[PDB]
Ligand binder design. Structure first.
Ligand SMILES: CCCCCCCC/C=C\CCCCCCCC(=O)OC[C@@H](O)CO
Ligand SMILES: CCCCCCCC/C=C\CCCCCCCC(=O)OC[C@@H](O)CO
Ligand SMILES: *C/C=C(C)/C=C/C=C(C)/C=C/C1=C(C)CCCC1(C)C
Ligand SMILES: CCCCCCCCCCCCCCCC
Ligand SMILES: CCCCCCCCCCCCCC
Ligand SMILES: CCCCCCCCCCCC
Ligand SMILES: CCCCCCCCCCCC
Ligand SMILES: CCCCCCCCCC
Ligand SMILES: CCCCCCCCCC
Length: 235
């Protein structure tokens, strides 16, 4: 029970690796956008911001994680709480959604509640992360419902023509969004096993979310950027 409940040099090394990749992606996108026509540049800037924020967060986690503070719980159930990741997510997950929202004609009211659910989800996550005992699962479950809500909203332009910008390319939107949803559903599983249940150790949770973050940010960004380039080229 509660195995390996503090970050070690294993977790720290993993964070430095993810830091390096996020920083490199931000730099590469920042140089690339200089060569691209103006209508494409917003999408590059969104992804430059995502990767820059993530690099900053991983720098913070790698430099400070060895302090083995703060913690939640006492005695044998005490476990380190890494909370920088939530500060990352409250800014980057709306930007990740924005990547796809930019490919739609969703009205402002709809974008608003999708983004609102997203921010709520992260908020319930960090509150749950610091909550000792069974009430943590109320936060968890409501956060999971918020993921379902934001996903439902993002799904609607797929089959609602009035929400579509360029219908002939619904396929690219659909594919990117399914990729995003698959990855995002893994995050609460990791949280449930780690921050929530104390079933997996802190280094393991670090590595798992490191892998997810690489897939969900710079690899996802490359997919989005390729999509908007190809679509713009065909218009
Ligand atoms: C122009 C606005 C740009 C967006 C606003 C800033 C975005 C935030 C950037 C990075 C967020 C993650 C860094 C947040 C820093 C977390 C601090 C930490 O890791 O604590 C370690 C513990 O040992 C101490 O208790
Ligand atoms: C659309 C494609 C979706 C792909 C989803 C891939 C999700 C990957 C995330 C997590 C998978 C598990 C990887 C984590 C691998 C285990 C980490 C580990 O063993 O830590 C070392 C310890 O033994 C020492 O303490
Ligand atoms: C780049 C960072 C990403 C894509 C982070 C995504 C995070 C989530 C999808 C978080 C989901 C959560 C729940 C649905 C319930 C509460 C716990 C969270 C915050 C891990
Ligand atoms: C679209 C919402 C999907 C939410 C999926 C949540 C999966 C939760 C799995 C939790 C695994 C850890 C169980 C707790 C062990 C103590
Ligand atoms: C949209 C569907 C929401 C599903 C929420 C799933 C929550 C998983 C329950 C984990 C609780 C474990 C308590 C020990
Ligand atoms: C705390 C809320 C942070 C949100 C910052 C990201 C905003 C992304 C733009 C959403 C579309 C308007
Ligand atoms: C040490 C464990 C390595 C796990 C590698 C997972 C990589 C996921 C690739 C998914 C591609 C879509
Ligand atoms: C009408 C059905 C609404 C279901 C919301 C969940 C969206 C699918 C997430 C996989
Ligand atoms: C720049 C894109 C990096 C994607 C890395 C995906 C592999 C993660 C497991 C090693």
């Amino acid at each position: 029970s509660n195995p390996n409940p503090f970050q070690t040099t294993l977790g720290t090394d993993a964070q430095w690796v993810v830091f390096a990749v996020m920083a490199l992606a931000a730099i590469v996108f920042s140089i690339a956008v200089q060569f691209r026509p103006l209508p494409l540049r917003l999408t590059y800037y969104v992804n430059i911001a995502i990767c820059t924020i993530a690099a900053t967060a991983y720098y913070a986690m790698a430099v400070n994680g060895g302090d083995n503070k703060p913690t939640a719980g006492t005695g044998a159930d005490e476990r380190q709480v890494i909370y920088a990741r939530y500060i990352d997510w409250v800014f980057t997950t709306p930007l990740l959604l924005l990547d796809l929202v930019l490919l739609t004609n969703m009205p402002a009211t709809m974008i608003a509640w999708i983004m609102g659910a997203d921010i709520a989800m992260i908020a319930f996550g960090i509150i749950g992360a610091f909550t000792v005992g069974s009430y943590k699962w109320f936060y968890f479950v409501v956060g999971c419902i918020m993921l379902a809500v934001l996903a439902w909203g993002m799904i609607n332009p797929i089959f609602k023509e009035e929400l579509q910008k360029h219908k002939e390319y619904t396929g690219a939107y659909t594919t990117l969004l399914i990729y995003l949803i698959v990855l995002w559903v893994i995050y609460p599983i990791v949280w449930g096993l780690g921050a929530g249940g104390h079933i997996i150790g802190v280094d393991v949770e670090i590595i798992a979310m490191g892998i997810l973050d690489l897939l969900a940010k710079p690899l996802y960004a490359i997919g989005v950027l390729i999509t908007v380039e190809v679509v713009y080229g065909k218009l």
